[PDB]
């Protein structure tokens, strides 16, 4: 194959640094014919499944139940149809019956290097020493693709706790031999201090959520600092949609005078940057197939949908020995294509990134709406204040969409008629985009809580919905 350090278990050279003139960290793996890479991926898939069969009773039980033996994996079509998908609920049950890391941990307790997890039943991540190096090496490779280089100051501004996002970006920065600046997030008073550090330090790259980048520009402005004077060449994000959302990407690129990159699958899927945009293929994300095998499937049969069609990402680790995920169902919605990429990398693409989680979708008069579609339409409006909330009910069918929208400070300062003009135009814009009646209630500028993490814009409470609709009928 000629694939750079193509081994299982993987063992990367910690001293390797690509030539300064190279666009690719691994020229072969990243640009080889897709059909040649798919031959080696299937080869690796067989190794991984044999490994999981040996060390994970969780996979041994699940596969035996669905009538699968690793020897039946003879093609990528066999993987799709014979291998059952892993659900996040299966991981919880495995961890409850086999605490703390479940019966899919594989490595002995002795090899466990880091303990992380989920929050908001939580799952524990028991990552081995070798897997941490595989994650760091994979991330340095993908960050190089974004134009991030050794010696560049990289600000990692996501919470350093159970959350894998921050740790993953730090591990990549460390291996890329960049100046890792792990400021983190989460504590009150952090954002006001961060803008001062960004003004002083002038970083080349920034990592966090797309929501935090917006909140931080407002903080920079309140602190009488200009976010374009932070010397950023790029901002790279994961955690939620935004970085491949038309109006959101444009607002962040304009506020910082830098490029925006979309990345991120799942925390269970670390190296989560396995889906990521590159400096030239800057819109959407590429599926780095030789790091993690991505399949975009029809949720009805868990089989790959054709290119140009929407489906759910199903992921398989190719370079992990601790808690390896084999066909984990994301529960997210995307669209994938297989056209020539501007960077020259021969990978499938998610041109619009990831739309959101299927469970977050709601319905108004037979029309399926994703919260990111509302966020996208509102962010493309000049008078929009940067924040909103969607008030819904899943206990009864909704006839109209209730929105609490913030106007801009200049729209508010322009008076009562100017506010009413924006409220009417916002309602109409959402209606033209979604094809459903939209009731808009204007709230005071900067009243809606901002976040340094993931934006939770849907209020699914029944009482709140009734209270709002009744108040919107009285006005």
Ligand X SMILES: CC(C)(O)C(=O)OP(=O)(O)OC[C@H]1O[C@@H](n2cnc3c(N)ncnc32)[C@H](O)[C@@H]1O
Which part of the chain contacts its own copies (CB under 8 A), choosing from 72-80, 121-129, 373-381, 429-437? Answer: 121-129
| Listed ranges 3-11, 174-182, 236-244, 389-397: which one lies at the site for ligand X (CB under 6 A) | 236-244
333: which residues sit within 8 A by CB, 6+ positions away? 310, 311, 312, 354, 355, 356, 357, 358, 361, 370
**What is the nearest approach in angstroms of its own copies to the Cβ of residue 160?**
3
Q: Report yes or no: 385 and 373 within 8 Å, Cβ to Cβ.
A: no
Residue closest to 153 by CA, chosen among 118, 202, 190, 187: 202
Q: What residues are paired with 368 via a beta bridge?
A: 363
> Is position 160 an interface residue for its own copies (rule: CB under 8 A)?
yes
Is residue 114 involved in binding its own copies (CB under 8 A)? yes
**Distance of closest approach, residue 287 Cβ to ligand X, in angstroms:** 12
Find which of ligand X, its own copies, none residue 406 binds, CB within 5 to 8 Å per kind.
none
Largest CA distance in the chain: 71
Within positions 363 to 382, which residues make up the interface with ligand X, using CB under 6 A? none
Q: Could you give the 3-state DSSP secondary structure of residue 107?
A: coil
Q: Is 183 in the site for its own copies (CB under 8 A)?
A: yes
Does 162 interact with its own copies (rule: CB under 8 A)? Answer: yes
Q: How far apart are CA 66 and CA 87, in angstroms?
A: 14
Candidates 39, 61, 74, 193: give the one binding its own copies (CB under 8 A).
Answer: 193
Is residue 257 annotated as involved in ligand binding? Answer: no
| Length of the chain (residues) | 475
Q: Determine whether the annotation assigns residue 29 to a binding site.
A: no
Bridge partner list, 237: 208, 262
Q: Over the Cα atoms of the chain, what is R_g?
A: 23
Does position 354 interact with ligand X (CB under 6 A)? The reply is yes
- Binding to its own copies by CB under 8 A, coded x per residue (else -) over 88-107, reads -----------xx-------
The nearest distance, CB 78 to its own copies, in angstroms, is 37
Single out the residue of 186, 308, 342, 415 in contact with its own copies (rule: CB under 8 A): 186
Binding partner of residue 241 among ligand X, its own copies, none, CB under 5 to 8 Å per kind?
ligand X
Residue 467 is assigned to a ligand binding site: no
Asked whether residue 298 is marked as a ligand-binding residue, the answer is: no
Name the residue nearer to ligand X (CB basis): 58 or 237: 237
- State the nearest-atom distance from the C-beta of 119 to ligand X, in Å: 9
- The verdict on 180 binding its own copies (CB under 8 A) reads yes
Question: Contact between 164 and ligand X (CB under 6 A)?
Answer: yes
- Sign, CA dihedral 4-134-279-232, equals negative
Among ligand X, its own copies, none, partner that 200 touches (CB below 5 to 8 angstroms by kind): its own copies
Is 186 or 415 the residue whose CB approaches its own copies more closely? 186
Measure Cα distances from 216 to 170, 207, 288, 411 in Å. Answer: 20, 12, 30, 21
CA distance 218 to 431: 29
Q: Give pairs for 169-172: CB < 8 Å, separation 24+.
A: 169/139, 169/143, 169/207, 169/236, 171/132, 171/135, 171/136, 171/139, 172/135, 172/136, 172/138, 172/139, 172/140, 172/142, 172/143, 172/273
The b/e string for 217-245 (b: 16+ C-beta within 10 A; e otherwise) is: bbbbeebebebeebebbbbbbbbbbbbbb
d(CA 405, CA 265): 29
Asked if 225 interacts with its own copies (CB under 8 A), we say no
Least distance to ligand X, CB of residue 158, Å? 8
Pairing of strands 124-128, 332-335: unpaired
Residue nearest to ligand X (CB): 264
CA distance 373 to 380: 11
Using CB under 6 A, which of 316, 330, 341, 427 touches ligand X? 330
Lookup result for tokens 């407002």 = 218
149 annotated as a binding-site residue:
no
The angle subtended at Cα 406 by Cα 355 and Cα 237, nearest 5°, is 35
Is 317 a known ligand-binding residue?
no
- 191 annotated as a binding-site residue: yes
Q: Does 159 bind its own copies (CB under 8 A)?
A: yes
Q: Binds 381, which of its own copies, ligand X, none (CB < 5 to 8 A, cut-off by type)?
A: none
Residue from 66, 81, 97, 187 in contact with its own copies (CB under 8 A) = 187
| Calpha distance 397→362 (Å, rounded) | 10
**What are the residues facing 390 on neighbouring strands?**
403, 458
Binding site membership for AMP: which residues?
Answer: 88, 267, 332, 368
Task: List residues near ligand X by CB under 6 A.
Answer: 164-165, 238-241, 262, 264-267, 272, 330, 332, 353-354, 357
Binding site membership: which residues?
Answer: 88, 187, 189, 191, 215, 267, 332, 365, 368, 437
Task: List residues near its own copies by CB under 8 A.
Answer: 99-100, 109-110, 112-117, 119, 124, 126, 129, 150-151, 153, 159-162, 167, 174, 177, 179-184, 186-188, 190, 193, 197, 200-201
């Amino acid at each position: 194959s000629g694939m750079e350090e193509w081994n299982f278990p993987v063992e990367y050279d910690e001293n390797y640094l690509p030539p300064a003139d190279s666009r690719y960290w691994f020229p072969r793996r990243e640009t080889m014919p897709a059909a040649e890479r798919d031959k080696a991926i299937l080869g690796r898939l067989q190794q991984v499944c044999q490994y999981a069969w040996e060390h994970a009773p969780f996979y041994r039980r699940k596969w035996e139940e669905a009538g699968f033996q690793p020897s039946q994996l003879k093609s990528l079509e066999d993987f799709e149809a014979r291998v059952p998908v892993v659900k996040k609920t299966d991981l919880r049950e495995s961890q409850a019956a086999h605490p703390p890391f479940g019966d899919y941990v594989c490595v002995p307790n002795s090899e466990i290097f880091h303990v992380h997890g989920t929050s908001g039943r939580p799952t524990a991540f028991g990552i081995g020493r070798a897997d941490w190096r595989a994650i760091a090496n994979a991330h340095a490779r993908i960050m190089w693709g974004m134009g991030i280089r050794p010696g560049d100051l990289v600000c990692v501004a996501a919470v350093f706790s159970l959350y894998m996002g921050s740790w993953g970006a730090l591990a990549g920065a460390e291996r890329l031999r960049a100046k890792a600046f792990p400021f983190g997030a989460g504590a009150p008073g952090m954002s006001a201090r961060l803008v001062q550090w960004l003004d002083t330090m002038k970083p080349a790259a920034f990592y966090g959520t797309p929501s935090y980048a917006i909140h931080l520009a407002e903080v920079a402005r309140e602190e009488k600092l200009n976010p374009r004077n932070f010397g950023l060449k790029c901002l790279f994000f994961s955690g939620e949609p935004g970085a491949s959302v038309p109006g959101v990407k444009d607002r962040i690129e304009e506020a910082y005078g830098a490029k925006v990159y979309d990345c991120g699958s799942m925390a269970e899927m670390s190296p989560f940057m396995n889906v990521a945009g590159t400096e030239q293929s800057n819109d959407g994300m590429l599926c780095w197939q030789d790091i993690i095998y991505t399949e975009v499937c029809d949720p009805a049969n868990m089989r790959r949908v054709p290119y140009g069609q929407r489906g759910t990402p199903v992921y398989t680790h190719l370079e992990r020995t601790s808690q390896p995920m084999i066909r984990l169902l994301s529960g997210d919605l995307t669209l994938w294509t297989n056209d020539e990429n501007p960077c020259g990398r021969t990978y499938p693409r998610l041109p619009q990134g990831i739309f959101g989680r299927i469970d977050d979708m709601f319905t108004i008069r037979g029309e399926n709406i994703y919260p990111s579609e509302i966020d996208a339409a509102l962010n493309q409006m000049s008078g929009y204040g940067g924040e909103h909330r969607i008030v819904i009910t899943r206990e009864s069918a909704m006839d109209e969409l209730l929105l609490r929208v913030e106007p801009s400070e200049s729209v508010h300062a322009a008076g009562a008629a100017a506010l009413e003009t924006f409220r009417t135009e916002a309602s109409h814009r959402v209606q033209t985009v979604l094809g459903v009646r939209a009731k808009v209630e204007l709230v005071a500028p900067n009243s809606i809580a901002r976040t340094d993490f993931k934006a939770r814009r849907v209020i699914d409470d029944r009482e709140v919905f009734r209270a709002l609709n009744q108040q919107l009928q009285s006005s």
